[PDB]
Structures are given as structure tokens and as C-alpha cells.
């Protein structure tokens, strides 16, 4: 019943070597590629304990009694348990309570309590935290009270004396029911974002794996693009579909955006991947925004030139400017640097690129986009992110370069770990040799 005949009772990440197990994860395909690349696998048990310990400590540090989580990404961080993640993002059927003493309860889908049993840090599997109109119609309120009473009892038993309960996001019916139980509702995101910002050693290992899988998937997509672009039928969607499939084949989870565009659709940026028929001798730019293997986000961006002619000089300049932008800004990264100083000292894009520059020069990343957000000086708000970088943070470093009314933009982005004494760029994906002007 082993899924890997070559191993003993456990896989390299410590999970059961059992083809019929409930728990999912990276595929044999992914494991083989990582092994061949000499990547160390994370130990999931140790990873889960690390996250749980850190999240409990965050609650304690703030003087709160507990943290209640409805965002599926927070639930994933706390428990490492998935359940229809994407459905969950807009249907709040699920909840995790983590109390100050570390006691953790999940309210799951009624039918699927077994989905988090692989994590013994989840002490109970309940149901009935689904407080929205589709699931309960005109009787949300009655169950909202049942749920809030359950939270009151758990908090009485596991955080006695505490009235402060942090909540990331909760339906209005839930909010009221909790407030009626005497809780003072605190900002859960301030707790979760700052906790998730520091990755432990296994999370970094998992991220190295996800990044490799993502670059492999992207490589397949580039092969497909260069082979098929300009054949009169291949569309943006056709190319992008390769990324989707190659991600899923490696045990990835979803893609957050539609950020792949061709030709004049790259400017302005943020136009979505669609039916456009791609053309020979045009730019194609994209952003992975990918929730990949082990549920880790890999958020990188590349711009390709595909054609029999040379890219225009203005395209080469833009690309080199973009590359310079991220390499300069990345070099600012080391422990102890204050976020607003990254803002104040960032590489200056030429005037003609300023109007359409990206919404940030950097941002955190983990299970998805995460705190912090490092804004350009003209958008930065004083007092918003007054904190220093620390080892174990991971920041994506961004560049969007294009002119107002122009017919192309460049998007580049690399994913960068903060180390004990500087940074390590985790992204190894090539830059288009033609656009870089290296021919």
C-alpha cells in the first residue's frame, strides 16, 4: 500500500508512505524532481508545531485570550488542513479557535471532520460555524448563538479571565453573537500577519520545494509559448493553461489572479489573461501568483519576447531598467532595516515610468501575499508599517515598467528570503536574454 516502493513507513517529509491515506500533498512527480535537484524536504510535523507554537505565542504576547479564524489561509497556517480552500474563501463554513494555552479547536464541514485529524494539535473536530445565508437561510442567527456559546465555554476553560478575542474576519451575525457573550473583538489579522511573517526552518524548506516546482511549471509554459505563439490560434488562455496543469500535477493548489497578458494588453498592466490570439514579435508578461506545492505561494514575474525579430530598443531599456530596479531594491534587504527606510531609499524609476509603477516595491509572501507591504514613497503612509525586517521573512521584490499610453510593459519579480545577515534570492528563473540586451 506504499505510494513510494523505495521508502519505508514514511515519506521524506515524515508523512505516511500510504497510497490510500486521507492527507494529500506533493505528488511522486514533484518528489522525484526535488530529489533529483538535491532539495531537503521539510518535516511537516515539526513545521506544524512551529506554526502552532508561534501563533499561540502571538496571542499571549498581546494579552489576548484567543484567536478565532475564518479566513482559509489563516486556518491553513494554524492547522495545515485544507478543505475546499477556494470555496471556503467566499463561503465562511469553517473556523479555528486557538486559545492562549495553545488549545485548538476546528469547526469543520459537518460531513468532513476527518480532514484535520492528521494534525493532533487540532484537539477537537466540531461543526456549526457556518454563519451565512446560503448555508442557513433565515436561521443563521440561531446557530450563531450556539456557536458563540461554544466559543465562550472553550474560552472560559482555556483562557479564564480573558475577554479579548482576536477575530480575522467574521460575518455580522457571528460578530454580534460573540459580542453578546461578552467578548471584546480584537483585530485578528494584526496577529496572523505578523505571526506568518517569520518562517521557521521547515517552512523555508517547503518554500524552496514549492519554488522549484513553480519554476519547473513555468519552464513548461515557456516551452509551450515559444513553440506555439503566433500560429494564429494559440491564445493567452492556452499558454496560461499549461501553468495551471503543471502546478496541479505537482500537488499545487490554485492561482490567485489572471495576470498573464500579450502584446498591447500588457499596458496598462493588470489586464487579465483571456482569449487574445498571440502574435509573433510581441511581449508576453506574467505573474505566477501561484499557490503551489505544500500550499506555499510562489509569486514571481517574468517578461518574454517571442519572435523572429529583435525586440525594440525601448523594450530592452525597460527590461534592463526593471531588472536594475529589483536588484537594487533587493540589495537593501537585511535584518534590522526598517520597512519605511526601504521605502525612503528605493531605486528611482525614470520619470516616464513613475505614473504606472507597481502598487508596492516589495511585499511579504508565505501561504499567499502577506504583510508587510512596502509602498513607494508617494503612496507610503506614515505609521503604517513601522517595523524592522527579521531573519525568516520572505519578500517578493517587484518591478512594473511601462509608459502612459505605451504599447508594452515589463513585469519582473523575484522572491527573496531574509537570512541572519542579509538576503538570499530564492528565484533562479532566467531573464529573457533578448530583452536583457544580452542577445
* Residues 379 to 438 in contact with Fe ion, rule: CB under 5 A: 396
The DSSP output letter for 172 is H
Cell of 388: 524592522
Q: Indicate left, alpha or beta for 339 from its phi (over 0: left) and psi (-120 to 50: alpha).
A: alpha
Interaction of residue 274 with its own copies, rule CB under 8 A: yes
Interaction of residue 370 with Fe ion, rule CB under 5 A: no
Contact partner at residue 277 from its own copies, Fe ion, none, CB < 5 to 8 Å by partner kind:
its own copies
Interaction of residue 257 with its own copies, rule CB under 8 A: yes
Q: Is the dihedral of CA 350, 355, 357, 362 positive or negative?
A: positive
Contact partner at residue 299 from its own copies, Fe ion, none, CB < 5 to 8 Å by partner kind:
Fe ion
Please give the residues from 290 up to 349 whose contact with its own copies meets the rule CB under 8 A: none
Residues 46, 205: Cα–Cα separation, whole Å: 12
Residues 150, 281: Cα–Cα separation, whole Å: 62
Q: Rank residues 282 and 299 by Cβ distance to Fe ion and give the closer one.
A: 299
Q: Where are the beta strands (DSSP E) in 277-319?
A: 282-287, 290-291, 297-298, 301-306
Work out which of 71, 108, 289, 370 binds Fe ion, going by CB under 5 A: 289
Interaction of residue 299 with Fe ion, rule CB under 5 A: yes
Residues 253, 217: Cα–Cα separation, whole Å: 13
Interaction of residue 44 with its own copies, rule CB under 8 A: no
**Strand partners of residue 399:** 412
Contact partner at residue 396 from its own copies, Fe ion, none, CB < 5 to 8 Å by partner kind:
Fe ion
Interaction of residue 272 with its own copies, rule CB under 8 A: yes
Interaction of residue 142 with its own copies, rule CB under 8 A: yes
Residue 305 contacts residue 286 (beta carbons within 8 Å): no
Contact partner at residue 57 from Fe ion, its own copies, none, CB < 5 to 8 Å by partner kind:
none
The DSSP output letter for 113 is G
Interaction of residue 287 with Fe ion, rule CB under 5 A: yes
Return the range that interacts with its own copies (CB under 8 A); candidates 251-259, 304-312, 321-329, 409-417. Answer: 251-259
CA dihedral 284, 290, 294, 295 (to 10 degrees): 180
**How many residues bind to its own copies according to rule CB under 8 A?**
102
List of residues contacting Fe ion (CB under 5 A): 287, 289, 299, 396
Amino acid at each position: 500500500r506504499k505510494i513510494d516502493p523505495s521508502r519505508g513507513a514514511t515519506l521524506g517529509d515524515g508523512t505516511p508512505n500510504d497510497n490510500d491515506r486521507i492527507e494529500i500533498g506533493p505528488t511522486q512527480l514533484a518528489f522525484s524532481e526535488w530529489a533529483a535537484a538535491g532539495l531537503q524536504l521539510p518535516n511537516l510535523d515539526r513545521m506544524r508545531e512551529y506554526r502552532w507554537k508561534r501563533l499561540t505565542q502571538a496571542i499571549v504576547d498581546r494579552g489576548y485570550g484567543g484567536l478565532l479564524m475564518f479566513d482559509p489561509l489563516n486556518i491553513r497556517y494554524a492547522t495545515d488542513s485544507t478543505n475546499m480552500q477556494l470555496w471556503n474563501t467566499h463561503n465562511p463554513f469553517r473556523a479555528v479557535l486557538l486559545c492562549a494555552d495553545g488549545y485548538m479547536v476546528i469547526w469543520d464541514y459537518k460531513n468532513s471532520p476527518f480532514l484535520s485529524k492528521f494534525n493532533p494539535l487540532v484537539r477537537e473536530q466540531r461543526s456549526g460555524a457556518d454563519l451565512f445565508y446560503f448555508d442557513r437561510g433565515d436561521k443563521v442567527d440561531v446557530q450563531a448563538d450556539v456557536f458563540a456559546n461554544e466559543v465562550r465555554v472553550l474560552m472560559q476553560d482555556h483562557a479564564p479571565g480573558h475577554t479579548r478575542l482576536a477575530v480575522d474576519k467574521i460575518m455580522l451575525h457571528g460578530l454580534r453573537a460573540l459580542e453578546a457573550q461578552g467578548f471584546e473583538i480584537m483585530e485578528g489579522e494584526e496577529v496572523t500577519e505578523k505571526t506568518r511573517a517569520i518562517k521557521g526552518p521547515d517552512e523555508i524548506l517547503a518554500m524552496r520545494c514549492a519554488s522549484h516546482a513553480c519554476e519547473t511549471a513555468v519552464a513548461e509554459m515557456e516551452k509551450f509559448a515559444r513553440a506555439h505563439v503566433g500560429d494564429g490560434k494559440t491564445s493567452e488562455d492556452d499558454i496560461w493553461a499549461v501553468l495551471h496543469a503543471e502546478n496541479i500535477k505537482r500537488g499545487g493548489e490554485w492561482i490567485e489572479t489572471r495576470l498573464l497578458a500579450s502584446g498591447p494588453r500588457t499596458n496598462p498592466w493588470f489586464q487579465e489573461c483571456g482569449p487574445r490570439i498571440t502574435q509573433k514579435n510581441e511581449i508576453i508578461a506574467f505573474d505566477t501568483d501561484l499557490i503551489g506545492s505544500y500550499g506555499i505561494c510562489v509569486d514571481i514575474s517574468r517578461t518574454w519576447w517571442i519572435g523572429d525579430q529583435k525586440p525594440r530598443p525601448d523594450m530592452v531599456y525597460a527590461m534592463q531598467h526593471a531588472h536594475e530596479h529589483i536588484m537594487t531594491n533587493m540589495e537593501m534587504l537585511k535584518p534590522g532595516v526598517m520597512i519605511p527606510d526601504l521605502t525612503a531609499n528605493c531605486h528611482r524609476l525614470d520619470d516616464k515610468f513613475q505614473a504606472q509603477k507597481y502598487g508596492c516595491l516589495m511585499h511579504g509572501v508565505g501561504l499567499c501575499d502577506e504583510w508587510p507591504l512596502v509602498a513607494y514613497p508617494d503612496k507610503a503612509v506614515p505609521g503604517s508599517y513601522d517595523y524592522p525586517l527579521e531573519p525568516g521573512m520572505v519578500l517578493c521584490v517587484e518591478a512594473a515598467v511601462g509608459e502612459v499610453g505605451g504599447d508594452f510593459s515589463i513585469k519582473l519579480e523575484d522572491q527573496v528570503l531574509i537570512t541572519e545577515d542579509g538576503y538570499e534570492n530564492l528565484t533562479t528563473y532566467p531573464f529573457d536574454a533578448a530583452l536583457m540586451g544580452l542577445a
